[PDB]
Amino acid sequence: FADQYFGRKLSPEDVANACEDGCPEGCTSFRELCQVEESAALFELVQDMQENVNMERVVFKILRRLCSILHADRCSLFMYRQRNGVAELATRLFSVQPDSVLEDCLVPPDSEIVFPLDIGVVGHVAQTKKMVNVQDVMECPHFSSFADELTDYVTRNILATPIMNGKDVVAVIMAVNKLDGPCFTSEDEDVFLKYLNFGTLNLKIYHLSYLHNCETRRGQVLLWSANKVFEELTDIERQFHKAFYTVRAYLNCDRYSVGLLDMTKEKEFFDVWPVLMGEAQAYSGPRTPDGREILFYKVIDYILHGKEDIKVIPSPPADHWALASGLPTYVAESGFICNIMNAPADEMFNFQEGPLDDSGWIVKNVLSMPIVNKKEEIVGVATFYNRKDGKPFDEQDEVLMESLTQFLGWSVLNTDTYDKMNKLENRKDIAQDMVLYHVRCDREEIQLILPTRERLGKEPADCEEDELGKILKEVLPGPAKFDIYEFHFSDLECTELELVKCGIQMYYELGVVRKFQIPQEVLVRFLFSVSKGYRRITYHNWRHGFNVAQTMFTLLMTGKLKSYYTDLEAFAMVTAGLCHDIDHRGTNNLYQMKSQNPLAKLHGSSILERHHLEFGKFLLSEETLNIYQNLNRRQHEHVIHLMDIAIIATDLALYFKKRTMFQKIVDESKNYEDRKSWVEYLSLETTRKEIVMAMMMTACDLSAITKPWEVQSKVALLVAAEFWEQGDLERTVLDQQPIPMMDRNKAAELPKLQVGFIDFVCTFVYKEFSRFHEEILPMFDRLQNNRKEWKALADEYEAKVKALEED
Amino acid sequence: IRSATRVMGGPVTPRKGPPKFKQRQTRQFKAFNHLELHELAQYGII
Amino acid sequence: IRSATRVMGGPVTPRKGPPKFKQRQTRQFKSKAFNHLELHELAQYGII
Amino acid sequence: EVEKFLDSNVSFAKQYYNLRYRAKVISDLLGPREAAVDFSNYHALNSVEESEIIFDLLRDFQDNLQAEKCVFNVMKKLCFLLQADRMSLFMYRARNGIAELATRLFNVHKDAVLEECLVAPDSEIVFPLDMGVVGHVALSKKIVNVPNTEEDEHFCDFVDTLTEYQTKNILASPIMNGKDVVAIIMVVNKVDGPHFTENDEEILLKYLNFANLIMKVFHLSYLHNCETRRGQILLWSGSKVFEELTDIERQFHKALYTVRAFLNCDRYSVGLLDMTKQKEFFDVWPVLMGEAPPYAGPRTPDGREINFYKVIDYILHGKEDIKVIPNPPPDHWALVSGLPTYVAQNGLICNIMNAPSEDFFAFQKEPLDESGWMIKNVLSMPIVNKKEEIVGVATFYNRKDGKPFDEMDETLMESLTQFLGWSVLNPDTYELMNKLENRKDIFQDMVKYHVKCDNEEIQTILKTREVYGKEPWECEEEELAEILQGELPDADKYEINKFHFSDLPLTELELVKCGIQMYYELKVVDKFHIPQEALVRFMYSLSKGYRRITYHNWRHGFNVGQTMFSLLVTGKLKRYFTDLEALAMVTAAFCHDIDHRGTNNLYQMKSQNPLAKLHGSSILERHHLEFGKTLLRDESLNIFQNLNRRQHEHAIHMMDIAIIATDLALYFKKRTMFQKIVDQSKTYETQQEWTQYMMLDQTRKEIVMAMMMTACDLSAITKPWEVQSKVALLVAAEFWEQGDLERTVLQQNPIPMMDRNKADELPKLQVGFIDFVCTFVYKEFSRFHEEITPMLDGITNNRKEWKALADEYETKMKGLEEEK
Ligand SMILES: Nc1nc2c(ncn2[C@@H]2O[C@@H]3COP(=O)(O)O[C@H]3[C@H]2O)c(=O)[nH]1
Ligand SMILES: Nc1nc2c(ncn2[C@@H]2O[C@@H]3COP(=O)(O)O[C@H]3[C@H]2O)c(=O)[nH]1
Ligand SMILES: [Mg+2]
Ligand SMILES: [Mg+2]
């Protein structure tokens, strides 16, 4: 056995046979004979890993012939993973030798020998991420013997390096012996760093594929959760159940259950009497960190092995298969992402050692995390009980499930908004019921209009229309005593009770009660209710609304404006003009913007005109107060459309913008010589009739300026009083300076304001309609008369101030 | 045991002490047409 | 600069035609207690 | 010497040379040494240098990979092994659902530098998939060889004449990552042969293994990065959309601004459309009349005008700049191109690779920014709010890398605009809540006005209009006391502080005056300085708050209030309760049944009334609690104005205790917790001073409060017969009305008392109520206080006189049965 001399024998002999070793392929010497065999073996290994990556099967072959080059007794791969913040190095391939099959060295998932961060050189290398060579293992300060006593093995010479993918260590491979050498001659260290360099290329491929799959799963689950969170607003239970059931093939679990925590924070006044009343001993168990009580009131568990068997527990007992472990009640005690290696071999939590069902189900890996709702408040605990792959939970699964639970916990604003919206809707319904009761006229006060308990013995509801009409024919006034067929219908003469009867009578004049077969009781009750609807403010009260209705009825009947419209379109107007000022608070539209009233926020433009419409439609929506019940759907929709064009059109702001079209229509009325054919022309057009109707909407509410001066003076005084009230109410609540007509101390300069109002806002609807129809000239003539009277008063005051200036 | 490398049941670790759980991540995510519009402004309209 | 391809500016396609654009994908998601001697005593009255 | 025959004979020295020099034979090969394969000679046939060239191929697998140099070296060597020149690596990408095939390494031959064999994405030829042998390889997914290209099918010569080349022969073979193509290597011509031989295919396949799995690493890394970024964008947006609940504009701005980094794009901008579908009624007349000619421009598929009322743009290539341009002009740099309006019209995911060659849209051709930045790559897609109607258009401009958007990049923000469209549920819910709350406030104001004592009827009681001459809210407090003395009835004469009091003779308005007086008799108005005008207004408004129903009208509330007032002043129960506590109890008893519909809680549960759906338990009591405080919360009608914060927080807190506790169900559950207190009261022997312990203790006081609420609500039994009979008739009528309402509305048979035809059984079902519900509280108080003894006499006498009728009916029934 030579020592050093035979150095020029091996290679220089150049195998002087040309066929030695049995078969060459063109080799020259020994150095050229190892090269070709190594290249062929490495190429075969590369071809093995070409497709359908098989990490273990090929790393085993790589380590099989790497040991021999190093003379190492055994070679072993140590996989690396992370759990709940601390890394862990599992034992995947162990004791690989040149004379071993794959199954002899592979370690199944239920046979790992995991090492922590620091214990042993296997962990010191992971912390260092560098090579370590230990000549004798007794000398190094850090070295574990836990892998010595089980294996019945003794180690005396180690050589380990970690497999790194950038900055993240993937695994560590360590030769455990040297055999024919005491201290791992450094010549072997370089080749070990190099021969294992292209074997690292496959470990990182496997790691990259695993990470890609995990992140694809996370993206899919997040997208599905976002899909089904936004479907609709639902309570917490249904939303969470939907979002959890919808994504169950991506979690790769077998069983997982979601527990819900009761959110009763503060007990109610009588709940806590007994506790300090010498009974009902107070709670003493664990508490949620925020200070609440831990009480799972609903647990939904999903089973994915065998059959879905999805079931809900409405009040789980203490011996539930999920809550009995004591882990779900511990995540509620403090917010931690609990992760367990071996559930059966645990002391803190009492996991059942035996099976649970005939299928033989034993829990091995558990992962529980809380559901925080963006307020650091624990809302529930979701626990996953195993993996389909069979391997214990890794860090990627932890990140995936943490992301899912974090998104779901963030998705509690939807349920909170659902509850708030339900409460607000219920409160609005209650308020509407109150208003309806306080506006509708009761049975004991409807007898003023039609007395049926005196004439008959029956309640008003328990009567026939033919018999009901007999009372009306007598109580209702005639068409001549109150002359509702005139343009100078004085209002202050009659009491507020007579106006309801006048309204009913003019509803009878149109011939509409019997045309659409509406019920008389409902009509009377609706008139009384709408009369009660108006407030008691100075001017805009029931009197003004009924005056508008009567003026428009006079326009239709004695103004010959009824020819264009049918009887149905006249039913929808006398009703719309009668309730157009139904809930007026005195303040005009401009005030709602400056006072930040809720009316301004609800409605953009025409704050108060658009608000009377909704109240008016609400009043005639419920039965026993609805006079449109018998109308079919088409007629009812047409009437709704007519009212919604009518009530809003009474606004003066919309009057100014949209007067030119009415002027054009009136001008176009002059090229038709036969006014009996203009009726035919205009009785078919829709938009033209709508414009004319919206114009007569505001040509009648601006009335009381065309009435005899005796009535006009009092009406003007009432209007000025209302404006002064608004102005006085404006310099204290808003602390501003009212406009001159709203100054109570500016009352002397009233007539000039009146003449300015007449010549600017008025005298256009009253001139175009006079030109359109000569039938409606008297209102224009009286308007001019009142204008001249107010100008005379203005000149009188001008003379007074002039005398003050030149006395 | 012969089948596995002297280990059965579940995995075994050379650690004895109190388990430490994750602390949870709380910081990663956190004018209409007019000659002179104001002629009618002196009244209630606008 | 050799440029290898001997072309500069922007990518060059052999065929020219009116742009064709992808359709939206919707084939996956939008596939659409009292302590008592006996309780009926209260039930006789408005209670419970 | 030389007779070492073991070495001489074969197969021994091999296993020693291994053990010794095998590491150094391997160590140098894998180092940095260059290949020892001669390339000048052409038909080498690679006898033993085949292994040397294999080691060089494995020499670049170290962990420093860019997937460009290694593949280029592999192709350099393959040009020598294949006996062919000018290889080319045609990359594979897909846009708009149609695949492309763009060159990455072009004109690669042996002895060439990488700088002159790499093509930048700026100038790269991009062939389609459906023509040429490149497309044939991409579709067939197998190696093909086509000698004499001029006589084979599907061969395109667009780049043959562009690069002034010939390409006599072609050999191409794809590389695939699990059924998915990633690239295609091409070979043109054979240097010293007529066409590629069969063995050349095998050589290429055998030497392509190294390059097949090195491109897979880069492809997987790119896919992993894309998936990670997609996961991040969907998780950084949930946080900013769930922080609060705001309108669409700000929510979209936040979600888009927080995920700027992951979307590695130089610029992007999002435009929002006007969502109104129907014009207003007064905005339609001019079009029909003839003015304002109608719209004839582009429209969305669902039939809406395409108007961008706000276009938010984000700039990142130079200096960060996020700005908003409300009502942007049509010539906005993001809107000059017709892409946004075209996407609005159609709704497709438009992807454009080049602006200079664009024809349909005609993008800008000048650098927009001061520094050279020209729009080249554009990706625009719409946003639909779950019903296939476009909400806006988002356009993403040049990437930070330089390559055109591909499918893995398109699916990145294609899943983000899906998220934005799905998130619209929150902006929608934002406006509904505001509108609904405004309607609730409006209707609450309506009802508040309806139940309120205005200036016309306030003078009915407090009349300063004629005897003084001015409205009440200007009179002085001392000047306001005189007008009440001559109007408020005297307590002594009117019998308002004794248990036997009947309000039948008194008028409806008289009870309001009695209630106003009852506050003075407690000497509580003066010490708390509460305004008298506000007190009068509140007392009068309480009358209007109550309904006009048969029994639970204002009269019952006043009777309960008077019962409490008597229990305090003549019952000597004031000792335990503080003066402020009396102020709270009297007012809580006055409005304990304010706004009573007329049906009990069971009908609320049965009929699904809106009250039931809001209050879990004791629906009517909680409803009356939340309505009696609303009237007390506003100025000019509140009586707690001159109370400091701790007294105010105390007084309101015990209104909940009293008003809620009047429920009968809540009474029976905790009936036996007051008897223990009563027993504790009789154990403090040698004095009558058990009061002093009561005063501090409190919880005892609260239970007594909850127990004297139940002793006042059902106080109708205690009145003399001449009033108890009438009250019993009224309550029976109310129950009959409830039964009639329940029979028809819900279609079920009521309990016996609510049935009309069981009227004759009223006395016998009334004695049962008196013996079961009553005669326990009124016995416990009687045994607990001797000053309230007359209440049990009035219960015993009333039951005695009820048994008369209960037995008269029994005799009648017995006689009628005997007739049978
Ligand atoms: N290959 C191999 N390694 C072993 C064997 N026994 C122990 N080891 C390793 O040798 C290491 C010596 O200390 P380590 O941290 O403590 O952990 C030990 C294991 O990684 C064995 O039989 N084969
Ligand atoms: N100059 C050059 N052209 C090539 C190379 N490889 C392929 N081509 C061209 O690219 C074209 C792609 O398909 P064509 O019909 O098949 O014919 C091909 C050649 O014209 C190469 O290495 N250099
Ligand atoms: Mg009005
Ligand atoms: Mg009650």
Ligand SMILES: [Zn+2]
């Ligand atoms: Zn009006």
Ligand SMILES: [Zn+2]
């Ligand atoms: Zn009551």
